[PDB]
Design a protein around this ligand. Structure first.
Ligand SMILES: O=P(O)(O)O[C@H]1[C@@H](OP(=O)(O)O)[C@@H](OP(=O)(O)O)[C@@H](OP(=O)(O)O)[C@@H](OP(=O)(O)O)[C@H]1OP(=O)(O)O
Ligand SMILES: Nc1nc2c(ncn2[C@@H]2O[C@H](COP(=O)(O)OP(=O)(O)OP(=O)(O)O)[C@@H](O)[C@H]2O)c(=O)[nH]1
Ligand SMILES: [Mg+2]
Ligand SMILES: [Zn+2]
Ligand SMILES: [Zn+2]
Ligand SMILES: [Zn+2]
Ligand SMILES: [Zn+2]
Ligand SMILES: [Zn+2]
Ligand SMILES: [Zn+2]
Lengths: 97, 112, 130, 56, 243, 188, 167, 56, 138, 41, 97
RNA sequence: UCUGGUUUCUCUUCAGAUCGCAUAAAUCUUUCGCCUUUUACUAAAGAUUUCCGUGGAGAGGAACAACUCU
RNA sequence: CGCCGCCAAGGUAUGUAUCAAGCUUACAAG
C-alpha cells in the first residue's frame, strides 16, 4: 500500500501536477572520489566535493520536446520453457473428420 | 474596455460619457463581440445583462429624465461578466493547455 | 561493528589483469559518488580562496589517513601565509583609484558605481580567412 | 524580500519586444506562447480592478 | 433518520447538581409554577431565553438571528409561531437571593393555538401575561385573561417591549407613562368585567406588573429597581420607597 | 525519458577546482545523437573558462565508456575510434533515425538497468589494454578545452565590450583543420 | 473606438503626460457631509489611518455613527425603505422554493420547470368517490393560498419548504 | 426581466452547497517567488494596453 | 505631467522641480532610444542608473543635506520621484553605494546568492572588469 | 525512468481526468461492513 | 432542549413520564393499582374555542390505511384540541381550530 | 515597585460557519426540449470537482517600537 | 400571467518528385 501510494502520489504529482508546489531545497552537496585519473589531474583532487542545485523552471513555457515517437515493441522477456504433456496425433481418419 | 478608458485619458471623451460607454459595452456584448458563437452557454449571461439593463434603465428614466442614452451605471453588468471569467479561467486555461501541448509536442495518434 | 573486521586487508596478488580504472572503486561509472553535509559557508570560503588565489585546503576522508596540506599551486599560499578573502589584509597594494561623481546633481556627469575606469595588421589575415 | 521596481522597466521591455518580428528576441517568443495558458487569468485580474467612475 | 432539535451535555448552570437538589427536595414544594401566556409575538419565548442565559454561562446570543431555542420544533423554527411549548425547570434568585424554583411553561400565543395554553392552565397557577407596550392588548390577550379568571388563576402581567415603545415609536417620557398607565388601566378594567375578585387589581405599586424588554434583557419593576437605587449610593430602605 | 543523479565527466572537463558548484535541470536539452531528453548539468570549471554544460545522455555515455560533454574516453582521455581500433572491435550502433537507432538504444538501456556501473560490452576487452594505448594517454591535461570560444566582433574588430568581452579575442581560427565513431579529422 | 491596423496606442508617448479630464465627483458640502468629506473620493478611502480601518491590507473597518449616518443619507436613491421582512410575504426565498416544488407561480414571481413530481394518477372510482361537484365551493382556492401553507390546501407535497409568518 | 432575475436569484440561493474546498494555494505568491516574475506598481490603462498588446 | 495627489504641493518644491524635470526628460530619452547594437540587457541598464540617481538626489537632499523638510520628502516618495524601499536599504549599515534592488534579491539569482556587484572590489581578484548583468556595473 | 505519456511525457490534461469523487465511502457499521461479516452465520 | 434524569419526584412539581401513555388520548390522572382510594377522575379541560373547521382526509394508497390511522391517532394524542372522526360513508375527518 | 505590542510580508496545517449577507464553469448519471449526425445547446433532479475569494494557526523578520494596554 | 435570437465539420479530392523562410542548437572540437 505504501509502495503504490508513493507511486500514485508521484503519478498525480506528475499527471496532474499543475497546482503550486515548492521547488526543492537542493543544498545537498555530493562528494565523489574521481576514481579514474587522479595523480596530477587537478593536483590534489583527491575527493572533489561539489554543490548541486536545481535550476528553476518558469511556469510560462510550453512542453519542450516532441513526444510523438513510435518505434516497434522490443524483444520481450526471453521465453520460459513450455513443458506440456506428450503431444499426440490422432489418426488420418479422425483428422479427416 | 481598455479602448474606452484610453479614449477617456486621451481626453477626447469625458467621464459621464465613458460611464455610459462601458455600460453599453457590458450590456451589449453578443452584439459587439460574437463570443456566444464559440461557447453558447454564456448566452445566458448575455441575456442576464440584457435583463438587468431594464432594471436600471427604467429607474434612470423615472421622472423628468428622458428616454435617451446616458445610463452610466455599469456595476451590474461588469459583475456578471466577471463572474463569467471566475469560472472560465480554469476551463479555457485547460483548453489552452491542451492546445499548446498539441502544438509543442504533437498529437498522439493511437494513445488514449 | 569492530575496527578489525573492516580494516582487515585482502589476500591476493591484487588482480593486475584489469586496468587501473576498472579495478578502482565506483558506484556511478565514474568514481564512488556519495552525499555530504558540509557547512555552506566554509565550503564557499575555501572555494573562493582557491578561485581567487589558486590554493585551498584539500577535502578528504581516507586518502593517506592523514591529510592536512594545501593544494593547487603551493608556494603562493605561504607567500600570503594562509590568509583569506574576507580578511583586511596586511598591505593595501596595487589598488586602482576610480574617479567618483556622487552628487546626483550634474546630468550626464553622475557616474555612481557605473563609473567607467580612468584607463578609458591582423585585419588582412581576418579578411583573407573570411 | 523582493519588491517593486521602477515602472519604466515594463515599458522598456515591451517597447523593445514590440511585435516579436525582429530576430534578436527569437529566444523569447516561445515563452510568449507559453504565457497563453495564463492569459484568461490575466484578463480576469485586469477586469476585477477597473477604476470606478469617481476616480481618475 | 431525522431528529427534532435534540440537545445533550446537561449544560453547566450554577448549582443544579446533587449538591443543590438535596435542598431542592423541600424546595420541590415551594416552586410557584407559572404558565406565561401572552398574545402572539410578545417576546415571552425570548423572555425565557433571557432568563436561561441568566442561568447558564454558555450562550450563542443573538448577533444575527434570535436565540429562540425554546421554540424547538422544525415546524416552528421556520414559521416562528410556536406550535408546542417546552416547559423549563430552573431556579431564580430574588432581591434577598437564596433561591426559588420556577418550573415555567411558555405556551404558543397564536389564537388557533388557544389549545395548549389551556393545557398549562389546568396544570399550574401562574398566568403572567405578556403585552407589547408599543401595540397594546389584543385578541388572545383579552380572551386569555378571560380564560384565566374563568379558571381563577393568579392574573399577574409582564408587559414587554418598551424599547419598542421608545427606540422605535420614540415617545417622550410623560407620554410613555401615559401609554403604560393606559395599558395597566385597560387590563385592570378588563379583569374587572367578571368581578368575583373585586379587590384584586394590578398596578406597579402592588408589585403586580413588571415591565421588560426581552430584546435587551431588562427586568424593571420598582421593588427590584430601588434595589439598584440601594446597592449603589442609596441606603434607601426600599419597598416603602418602591411603593 | 531519462533522469539522472550525477554525470559521467572526465577530469579535464571538471576544471582545476576541487570545489565546483553545478546546477541541474530535470529534462534539459536533448541528446545530440539520439534526441533523448537527459538532465543537462552546468558548472564553471575555472575563472577564465566557459561553462561546458552536458552534451549526451547517460545512456549514450554508458554505451562507449565516454565522458559526458567533451566526448572522450573515460579511461584514457582519447577519442572514440582510437579506442575501438586500439581494441580492434567497434561495438556497432546504427546511423539513421529509427532504422535500428532508437530501437537499439531503448533495448540496450533496458538491458543496462541492472548494473549502472560499467559499459555494456567493452568490459571484457577493456582489461587486455595498456600496451598500444598507454603510450598516448595524455595525463595532466591541457585546459584549452575549457577556454571560451572565440567571439565575433573581434573577428570584425567591432567589439564594443572592450575588456569585458568574456569570450576571447586575437585567436583567428584556421579553416583547414578543426562525429561519434567515424570519421574525425584530427584523429587521422 | 479604434480602427483596425492601428496598434494599441503605446502608453509612453501618447497619454503618459496627458492629464485626465475630470471624474464624476458629486460635490459634497460641509456642515452636513462633514465627516466623510476629506476621504470620500479616494482609491481606498481610509487606508493609512489606524482609527477607522485595519491597516494596509484593508480587511477590517470600524466607523462612528455620524460618519455612517452621513453615508446612509448619501446612499439613498438605491436603498429600500422597507423596515422589515413583512413586505416580502410570499416573495420570500422559501415561498419561491415552495412555488418551484409545487409547479405553480406567485404572480410576478419566477416560473420554473417541473421536477420529478410530474404526473399523478388516480383511478376513476377513487377520485370520483372523493371529489365530485359535491363540495361546497364558496370562493376559489387561489395559488397564493397553496404557496402560503402547502399542506391542507395541497395533497401530495414534497421537496417543499415552509415560509415565515408575520415578523 | 424582473421575474427572470428572481429566477436566477432563487436558483443561486437554492443550490448553495457549502464550500468544501480543501487547500488554499495562490498562483501569484507562487509566481513571484520565481526569478522570472518581477513586481511593479503601474497605471491602470498602462496595464490594460499592456495585456491587450500581449494578447495580440 | 501626472501628479496624482491634487495637492498643490508644499515648499520648497519649486527649487527641486527644474532638477526633477531634467531627470524625467533624461529618463524619457533613456526609455525611448532604440535597442539596436545595445545587446540584450545593456539596453535596460540606464533606466536603473537614472532611477538610482533620482532616488539618490532626493536621498542626499533630505537625510544628508537637511534642506528639504520631511513633508516634501514624503511627498516626493508618495508621488513617485523616489523609492520607499531603496532608501531603506541605503539607510542600513554596510551598503549605501548600492546599485539597485536586484542585487539584493537572493532568489533572482539561481545559486541563492547576492550578485557580484555587491562584492568588495578590494577583496575580489585584481583584474576582471565585470559589470553586473542585472543592474549595470560596480 | 521515462514512463508513458500519462506520467511526465504529456501536458494533455484531458477532461474526464479531473479530480472527481476524490474520496472513498467505506461501508459503515449499519451495513455489511466486514467486521459484521467475520462472525455471522 | 435538554433532559436531566430524575430518580424520584415529590409533589408540587411537574414531570414527564416515560411510557404510561399507550392507553390514553387526552388528559387523565394516575394512581397506584392496589384497589386504593378511587380518585374520581379529573375533568377534561375546556378549550374555550370550538373546533369548527372540518377537512375530510383519505390515504392515497387504499391498501395501507392502518398506518395512516396510527399516524392519525398519534396526531390526536399530540394535539389536544383536535377532534378526529370516522363516519358511515367511510371517509376519515379531522376538525380543528 | 515589577509585569510590557499593533501593523505588513512569506509558510503551517485545521476548515464545518450565510467558510462568501453574491455566486461562476466543468465532469458523470438520469429525465426533459429543440434535433439528422457530432461538438456549440436546452432546463430540472441527483453527486461530484475545478476556479474567484475568505476564517483560525504555528514560525521568520522588518516596519516609531518603546509609546505604554497590561 | 407574454417561448423565441446559432457557430464548426459534413464538397469542390490526395499522393508523389525538385526549389526558399518558418522554426531549431548557437553547441562537442588539436
Ligand atoms: O437594445 P437597444 O434596442 O439598443 O435599446 C435598448 C433597449 O432595447 P431592448 O429593450 O430591446 O433590450 C430598450 O429599447 P427598446 O426596447 O424600446 O428598443 C431600452 O428601453 P427604452 O427604449 O424604454 O429606453 C433602451 O432604449 P432607449 O434608446 O429608448 O433608451 C435601450 O437603448 P440602449 O441601446 O441605449 O441601451
Ligand atoms: N423590540 C423588541 N422586540 C422583541 C422583544 N422581545 C422579542 N422581540 C421580537 O419579537 C419577535 C417574536 O417574539 P418571540 O421571540 O418569537 O417570542 P414570542 O412572543 O413568544 O413569540 P411566540 O413563541 O410565537 O409566542 C422576535 O423576533 C423578537 O425579535 C423585545 O423585548 N423588544
Ligand atoms: Mg459520418
Ligand atoms: Zn543519448
Ligand atoms: Zn569530457
Ligand atoms: Zn570581443
Ligand atoms: Zn551595486
Ligand atoms: Zn542595481
Ligand atoms: Zn550586480
Amino acid at each position: 500500500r505504501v509502495a503504490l501510494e508513493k507511486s500514485v502520489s508521484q503519478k498525480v504529482a506528475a499527471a496532474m501536477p499543475v497546482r503550486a508546489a515548492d521547488k526543492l531545497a537542493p543544498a545537498q552537496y555530493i562528494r565523489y572520489t574521481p576514481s579514474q585519473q587522479g595523480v596530477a589531474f587537478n593536483s590534489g583532487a583527491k575527493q572533489r566535493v561539489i554543490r548541486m542545485v536545481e535550476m528553476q523552471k518558469d511556469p510560462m513555457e510550453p512542453p519542450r520536446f516532441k513526444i510523438n515517437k513510435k518505434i516497434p515493441r522490443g524483444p520481450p522477456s526471453p521465453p520460459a520453457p513450455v513443458m506440456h504433456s506428450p503431444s499426440r496425433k490422432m489418426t488420418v481418419k479422425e483428422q479427416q473428420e | 474596455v481598455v479602448d474606452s478608458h484610453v479614449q477617456y485619458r486621451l481626453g477626447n471623451v469625458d467621464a459621464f460619457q465613458l460611464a455610459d460607454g462601458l455600460q453599453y459595452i457590458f450590456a451589449h456584448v453578443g452584439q459587439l463581440t460574437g463570443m456566444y458563437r464559440y461557447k453558447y452557454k454564456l448566452m445566458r449571461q448575455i441575456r442576464m445583462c440584457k435583463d438587468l439593463k431594464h432594471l436600471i434603465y427604467y429607474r434612470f428614466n423615472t421622472g423628468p429624465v428622458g428616454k435617451g442614452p446616458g445610463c452610466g451605471f455599469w456595476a451590474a453588468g461588469w459583475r456578471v461578466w466577471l463572474f463569467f471569467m471566475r469560472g472560465i479561467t480554469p476551463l479555457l486555461e485547460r483548453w489552452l493547455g491542451n492546445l499548446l501541448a498539441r502544438q509543442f509536442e504533437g498529437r498522439h495518434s493511437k494513445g488514449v | 561493528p569492530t575496527y578489525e573486521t573492516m580494516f582487515a586487508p585482502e589476500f591476493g596478488p591484487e588482480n593486475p589483469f584489469r586496468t587501473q580504472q576498472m579495478a578502482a572503486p565506483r558506484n556511478m561509472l565514474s568514481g564512488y559518488a556519495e552525499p555530504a553535509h558540509i557547512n555552506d559557508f566554509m565550503f564557499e570560503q575555501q572555494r573562493r580562496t582557491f578561485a581567487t588565489y589558486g590554493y585551498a585546503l584539500d577535502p578528504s576522508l581516507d586518502n593517506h589517513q592523514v591529510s592536512a596540506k594545501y593544494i593547487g599551486s603551493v608556494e603562493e599560499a605561504e607567500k600570503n601565509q594562509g590568509l583569506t578573502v574576507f580578511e583586511t589584509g596586511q598591505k593595501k597594494t596595487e589598488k586602482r583609484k576610480k574617479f567618483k561623481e556622487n552628487d546626483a546633481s550634474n546630468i550626464d556627469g553622475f557616474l555612481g558605481p557605473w563609473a567607467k575606469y580612468v584607463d578609458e595588421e591582423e585585419q588582412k589575415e581576418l579578411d583573407e580567412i573570411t | 524580500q523582493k519588491e517593486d521596481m521602477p515602472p519604466e522597466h515594463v515599458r522598456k521591455i515591451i517597447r523593445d519586444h514590440g511585435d516579436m518580428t525582429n530576430r534578436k528576441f527569437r529566444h523569447d517568443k516561445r515563452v510568449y506562447l507559453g504565457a497563453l495558458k495564463y492569459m484568461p487569468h490575466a484578463v480576469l485580474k485586469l477586469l476585477e480592478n477597473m477604476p470606478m467612475p469617481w476616480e481618475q | 433518520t431525522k431528529k427534532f432539535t435534540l440537545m445533550e451535555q446537561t449544560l453547566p448552570v450554577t448549582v443544579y447538581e446533587m449538591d443543590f437538589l438535596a435542598d431542592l427536595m423541600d424546595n420541590s414544594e415551594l416552586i410557584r409554577n407559572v404558565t406565561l401566556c401572552g398574545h402572539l409575538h410578545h417576546g415571552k419565548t425570548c423572555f425565557v431565553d433571557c432568563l436561561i442565559e441568566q442561568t447558564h454561562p454558555e450562550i450563542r446570543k443573538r448577533y444575527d438571528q434570535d436565540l429562540c431555542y425554546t421554540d424547538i420544533l422544525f415546524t416552528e423554527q421556520e414559521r416562528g409561531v410556536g406550535i408546542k411549548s417546552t416547559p423549563v425547570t430552573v431556579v431564580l434568585p430574588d432581591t434577598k437571593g437564596k433561591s426559588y424554583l420556577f418550573n415555567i411553561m411558555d405556551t404558543p400565543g397564536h389564537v388557533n393555538f388557544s389549545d395548549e395554553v389551556t393545557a398549562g392552565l389546568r396544570i399550574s397557577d401562574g398566568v403572567v401575561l405578556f403585552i407589547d407596550a408599543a401595540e397594546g392588548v389584543m385578541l388572545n390577550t383579552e380572551r386569555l385573561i378571560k380564560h384565566a379568571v374563568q379558571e381563577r388563576l393568579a392574573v399577574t402581567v409582564c408587559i414587554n417591549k418598551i424599547d419598542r415603545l421608545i427606540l422605535e415609536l420614540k415617545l417622550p417620557p410623560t407620554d410613555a407613562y401615559y401609554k403604560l398607565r393606559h395599558i395597566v388601566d385597560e387590563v385592570n378594567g378588563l379583569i374587572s368585567m367578571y368581578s368575583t375578585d373585586e379587590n384584586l387589581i394590578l398596578s406597579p405599586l402592588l408589585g403586580n406588573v413588571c415591565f421588560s424588554s426581552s430584546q435587551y434583557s431588562i427586568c424593571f419593576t420598582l421593588g427590584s429597581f430601588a434595589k439598584i437605587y440601594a446597592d449603589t449610593f442609596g441606603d434607601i430602605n426600599y419597598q416603602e420607597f418602591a411603593k | 525519458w531519462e533522469d539522472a543523479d550525477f554525470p559521467i565527466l572526465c577530469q579535464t572537463c571538471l576544471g582545476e577546482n576541487p570545489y565546483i558548484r553545478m546546477t541541474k535541470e530535470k529534462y534539459g536539452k536533448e541528446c545530440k545523437i539520439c534526441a533523448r531528453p537527459f538532465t543537462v548539468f552546468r558548472w564553471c570549471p575555472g575563472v577564465r573558462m566557459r561553462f561546458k554544460k552536458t552534451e549526451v545522455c547517460q545512456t549514450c555515455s554508458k554505451l562507449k565508456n565516454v565522458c559526458q560533454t567533451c566526448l572522450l574516453d573515460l579511461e584514457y582521455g582519447l577519442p572514440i575510434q582510437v579506442r575501438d581500433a586500439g581494441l580492434s572491435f567497434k561495438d556497432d550502433m546504427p546511423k539513421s533515425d529509427v532504422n535500428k537507432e532508437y530501437y537499439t538504444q531503448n533495448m540496450e538501456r533496458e538491458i543496462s538497468n541492472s548494473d549502472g556501473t560499467r559499459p555494456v560490452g567493452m568490459l571484457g576487452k577493456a582489461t587486455s589494454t595498456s600496451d598500444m594505448l598507454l603510450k598516448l594517454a595524455r595525463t595532466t591535461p591541457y585546459y584549452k578545452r575549457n577556454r571560451p570560444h572565440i567571439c565575433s566582433f573581434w573577428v570584425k574588430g567591432e567589439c564594443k565590450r572592450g575588456e569585458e568581452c568574456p569570450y576571447r579575442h586575437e585567436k583567428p581560427t584556421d579553416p583547414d583543420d578543426p562525429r561519434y565513431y567515424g570519421i574525425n579529422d584530427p584523429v587521422a | 473606438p479604434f480602427d483596425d491596423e492601428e496598434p494599441p496606442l503605446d502608453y509612453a508617448d501618447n497619454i503618459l503626460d496627458v492629464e485626465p479630464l475630470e471624474a464624476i465627483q458629486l460635490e459634497l458640502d460641509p456642515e452636513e457631509d462633514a465627516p466623510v468629506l476629506d476621504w470620500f473620493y479616494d482609491h481606498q478611502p481610509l487606508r493609512d489611518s489606524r482609527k477607522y480601518v485595519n491597516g494596509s491590507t484593508y480587511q477590517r473597518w470600524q466607523f462612528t455613527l455620524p460618519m455612517m449616518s452621513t453615508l446612509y443619507r448619501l446612499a439613498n436613491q438605491l436603498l429600500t425603505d422597507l423596515v422589515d421582512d413583512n413586505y416580502f410575504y410570499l416573495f420570500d426565498l422559501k415561498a419561491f422554493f415552495t412555488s418551484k416544488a409545487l409547479n405553480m407561480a406567485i404572480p410576478g414571481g419566477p416560473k420554473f420547470e417541473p421536477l420529478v413530481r410530474d404526473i399523478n394518477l388516480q383511478d376513476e372510482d377513487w377520485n370520483e368517490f372523493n371529489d365530485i361537484n359535491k363540495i361546497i365551493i364558496r370562493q376559489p382556492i387561489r395559488t397564493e393560498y397553496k404557496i402560503a401553507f402547502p399542506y391542507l390546501y395541497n395533497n401530495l407535497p414534497h421537496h417543499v419548504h415552509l415560509t415565515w409568518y408575520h415578523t | 426581466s424582473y421575474q427572470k432575475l428572481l429566477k436566477y436569484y432563487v436558483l443561486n440561493a437554492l443550490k448553495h452547497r457549502p464550500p468544501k474546498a480543501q487547500k488554499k494555494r495562490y498562483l501569484f505568491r507562487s509566481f513571484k517567488a520565481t526569478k522570472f516574475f518581477q513586481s511593479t506598481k503601474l497605471d491602470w490603462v498602462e496595464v490594460g494596453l499592456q495585456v491587450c498588446r500581449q494578447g495580440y | 505631467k501626472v501628479k496624482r495627489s491634487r495637492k498643490a504641493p508644499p515648499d520648497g518644491w519649486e527649487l527641486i522641480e527644474p532638477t526633477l524635470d531634467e531627470l524625467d526628460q533624461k529618463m524619457r530619452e533613456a526609455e525611448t532610444e532604440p535597442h539596436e547594437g545595445k545587446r540584450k540587457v545593456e539596453s535596460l541598464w540606464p533606466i536603473f542608473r537614472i532611477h538610482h540617481q533620482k532616488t539618490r538626489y532626493i536621498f542626499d537632499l533630505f537625510y544628508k543635506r537637511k534642506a528639504i523638510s520631511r513633508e516634501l520628502y514624503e511627498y516626493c516618495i508618495k508621488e513617485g520621484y523616489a523609492d520607499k524601499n531603496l532608501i531603506a536599504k541605503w539607510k542600513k549599515q554596510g551598503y549605501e553605494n548600492l546599485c539597485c534592488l536586484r542585487c539584493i534579491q537572493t532568489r533572482d539569482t539561481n545559486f541563492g546568492t547576492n550578485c557580484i556587484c555587491r562584492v568588495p572590489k578590494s577583496k575580489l581578484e585584481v583584474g576582471r572588469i565585470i559589470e553586473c548583468t542585472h543592474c549595470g556595473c560596480r | 525512468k521515462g514512463e508513458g505519456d500519462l506520467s511526465q511525457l504529456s501536458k494533455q490534461y484531458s477532461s474526464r481526468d479531473l479530480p472527481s469523487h476524490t474520496k472513498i465511502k467505506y461501508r459503515q457499521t449499519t451495513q455489511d461492513a466486514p467486521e459484521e461479516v467475520r462472525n455471522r452465520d | 432542549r435538554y433532559h436531566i434524569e430524575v430518580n424520584r419526584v415529590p409533589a408540587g412539581n411537574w414531570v414527564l413520564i416515560e411510557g404510561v401513555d399507550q392507553p390514553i388520548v387526552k388528559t387523565a390522572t394516575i394512581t397506584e393499582p392496589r384497589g386504593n382510594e378511587e380518585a374520581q377522575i379529573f375533568r377534561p379541560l375546556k378549550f374555550n374555542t370550538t373546533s369548527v373547521i372540518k377537512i375530510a382526509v383519505e390515504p392515497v394508497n387504499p391498501s395501507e390505511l392502518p398506518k395512516m390511522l396510527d399516524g392519525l391517532r398519534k396526531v390526536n394524542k399530540s394535539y389536544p384540541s383536535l377532534t378526529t372522526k370516522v363516519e358511515e360513508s367511510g371517509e376519515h375527518v379531522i376538525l380543528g381550530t
